[PDB]
Design a binder for this molecule. Structure first.
Ligand SMILES: Cc1cc2nc3c(=O)[nH]c(=O)nc-3n(C[C@H](O)[C@H](O)[C@H](O)COP(=O)(O)OP(=O)(O)OC[C@H]3O[C@@H](n4cnc5c(N)ncnc54)[C@H](O)[C@@H]3O)c2cc1C
Ligand SMILES: Cc1cc2nc3c(=O)[nH]c(=O)nc-3n(C[C@H](O)[C@H](O)[C@H](O)COP(=O)(O)OP(=O)(O)OC[C@H]3O[C@@H](n4cnc5c(N)ncnc54)[C@H](O)[C@@H]3O)c2cc1C
Lengths: 394, 394
């Protein structure tokens, strides 16, 4: 079996890299462990950078997103009874963000890949990677019990945190940087109209809460919960009582509550590997780095990794400039580390930590009062929240 | 013995509060434990906010400062071989800072208080404070062995971290917020021309260094040193070898070294008490709060405390509006906490910490790369370094 770029994973990273490449004429096969339904059941992301909106347009897959996606021009931060709105458009020089769920982006690309006839093997069990420093790397896997071989020029590991491709690099060639946080996010999806037309991130003594949305009639909410927590200890009513308690009263009062469609606990983690490549293997998205959800940067970082792997494989095939692929990691990590710092900063100023002495509680309150009350403070949150520019390539 | 405002301490806080008050006709006595020479031997501060320059002018004591002080329009930060200049004037909207040592300010006010004939008792031993919630507070002390009583309307504790007046408040009425840092600053004063016309704060693997100045021919330098350290383990040559090692080569090369006039180790500490007053006692400067030297804010915070205690005792005497003194702490702490956060931030991004995992080292490098490479990042350092505005009073 033979292809030009083999892609491990049909989550948003693999599907969008696969789409862009097909449209430029560069053949590619996607391998996925799970069924299409398993992949589409994941709720994940809601906020999308303008940079990601332009890439879906470049890939020809924006009909529904331009239709149904919501453009947002501001977000709110609430702490100490105050609600302070950051006008993102005014403060970033006109950039805005787009709310469109991750299930929906993945569905659109799954549909778009099928129409155009590109190759996708779901239920590919036991994927293994071989001969990474050769000229002919290959991938082995099992489909319904029989072991097949796929031959390629290059491999793109787009398989998330627990994928096989970071594990397939000699660990001595990698440096891992990680922080695990002492809490998670209990998220709840409800078919109810949202409490506001923009998002409200909130700092509260009991811990963090988030008001987010999927459309005019579907909502996504999160509360901070300690790592001890089991999702079956949280009834829908237990969760709504607790969300109402962490919010400003004039906002908890008009909240339309309702039963969940989905309820899950996501642990928080910062994680980076350097370099993001080995021989003919290039890592993208969560295969290479994790951010805490607080900056809404994870999927937007997959997109820039993919936008950078695509433009370098294009120069490599169309222009024969195959040497430029050694720059993939140096270009991606400049962007990745600045988003890791924004995501860490948002996480330490909006959440409640364990054994936080009186002084750190007060510096945390003062970070929020300074960045929110200063034009220069407001602009650093804002240019980072809409998303810092994408690097030029050559 | 009787006065209107009794002042404990003749360091810059007490002397400047005392000066301002005299000139408005409000009598005051200063009490000091030490001799004039002991007070003038302390080197301390070098950087002065515009806000402090206007106050010394208001107090009629700026002849030498306008003559000899250096106005600076920028500072440098060095990390990872890079030197990045912050243009303070451009980024704060024209505010600048003034370099003029603390010894010099104190000498000018000591001279100015003597000329005008105002009362100062040096070598006042064992100062005690009495009847703080009364209408007639009094101060007791010993001059050459005999115990005298001074009667006043109000008491201003301007006696630094180890003074008697914070100790004279019932501890249950106070909340202390403190962080002790795991290192100090070894400072060295030399009669040599400085290495640059502006200050260079530097982050280095070996730890922190600072290039500062007193005039065209006197210099002040600091290196980070662990708390274990004894100043007699640091010969002048040991110190110059180590300072040269923490700097960029093109800067260590043109450094003019020379023997010290003064060499001392100052420990680093953040400290705040709330409230800053009790009955007829009002705390000012280091009596109430400590910042790490990294933001050059300590003496500039004493000045705003004094500018706020003066304008409220003026309304209390001239205008009979004695009730406004209950606002002293609420007005001072808004400014104090934003400067405590800037001083803490500068401290955590320029110093080397113990048992710093790989991830925090990398976020520290990325804080410096983001705040230094962004117009909005540069403006938040800059408006905070020249000094946030002083609050209106009524
Ligand atoms: C609570 C939560 C909220 C978030 N909110 C946001 C937000 O608003 N904005 C934002 O930008 N980010 C957010 N994110 C992050 C975002 O969802 C991820 O960064 C994103 O899914 C990355 O996509 P990916 O394709 O790299 O990885 P994934 O989505 O993990 O896709 C990887 C795919 O590879 C497959 N795979 C794994 N192992 C193998 C194997 N051995 N062989 C074959 N296939 C394999 C998996 O089955 C999966 O289908 C959020 C995440 C969470 C959990
Ligand atoms: C390394 C170093 C560098 C610094 N660099 C800067 C900088 O550039 N910029 C800046 O803004 N700040 C800086 N500071 C801080 C600054 O020097 C202090 O914040 C400042 O001295 C405050 O003045 P004060 O009058 O409140 O206190 P002090 O200067 O401590 O004066 C208090 C006086 O009260 C006396 N006193 C104490 N107990 C009694 C008693 N019981 N009875 C009577 N009198 C008593 C003491 O003897 C002393 O004379 C620096 C400090 C250090 C150590």
């Amino acid at each position: 079996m033979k292809t030009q770029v083999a892609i491990i994973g049909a989550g948003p990273s693999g599907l969008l890299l696969g789409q862009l490449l097909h449209k430029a004429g560069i053949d590619n096969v996607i391998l996925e462990r799970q069924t299409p339904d398993y992949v589409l059941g994941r709720i994940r992301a809601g906020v999308l950078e303008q940079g990601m909106v332009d890439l879906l347009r470049e890939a020809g897959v924006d009909r529904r997103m331009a239709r149904d996606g919501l453009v947002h021009e501001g977000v709110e931060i609430a702490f100490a009874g105050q609600r302070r709105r950051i006008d993102l458009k005014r403060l970033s020089g006109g950039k805005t963000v787009t709310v469109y769920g991750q299930t929906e982006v993945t569905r659109d690309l799954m549909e778009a890949r099928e129409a155009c006839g590109a190759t996708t093997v779901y239920q590919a069990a036991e994927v293994r990677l071989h001969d990474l420093q050769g000229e002919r790397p290959y991938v082995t896997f099992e489909r319904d019990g029989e072991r097949l071989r796929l031959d390629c020029d290059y491999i793109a590991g787009c398989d998330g945190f627990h994928g096989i491709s970071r594990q397939s690099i000699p660990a001595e060639r990698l440096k891992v940087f990680e922080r695990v946080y002492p809490f998670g996010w209990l998220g709840l999806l409800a078919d109810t109209p949202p409490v506001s037309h923009e998002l409200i991130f909130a700092n509260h003594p009991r811990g963090f809460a988030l008001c987010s949305q999927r459309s005019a009639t579907r909502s996504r909410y999160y509360v901070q919960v300690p790592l001890s927590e089991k999702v079956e200890d949280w009834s829908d009513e237990r969760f709504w009582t607790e969300l109402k308690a962490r919010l400003p009263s004039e906002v908890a009062e008009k909240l339309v509550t309702g039963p969940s469609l989905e309820k899950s606990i996501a642990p928080l983690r910062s994680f980076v590997v350097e370099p993001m490549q080995h021989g003919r293997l290039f890592l993208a998205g969560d295969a290479a780095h994790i951010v805490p959800p607080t900056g809404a940067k994870g999927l937007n970082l997959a997109a820039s990794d993919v936008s950078t792997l695509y433009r370098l494989l294009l120069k490599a095939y169309r222009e024969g400039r195959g040497e430029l692929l050694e720059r993939y990691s140096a270009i991606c990590l400049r962007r990745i580390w600045k988003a890791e710092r924004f995501s860490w900063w948002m996480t330490s100023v909006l959440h409640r930590f364990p054994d936080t002495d009186a002084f750190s509680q007060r510096i945390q309150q003062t970070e929020l009062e300074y960045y929110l009350g200063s034009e220069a403070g407001l602009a650093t949150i804002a240019e980072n929240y809409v998303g810092l520019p994408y690097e030029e390539i050559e």
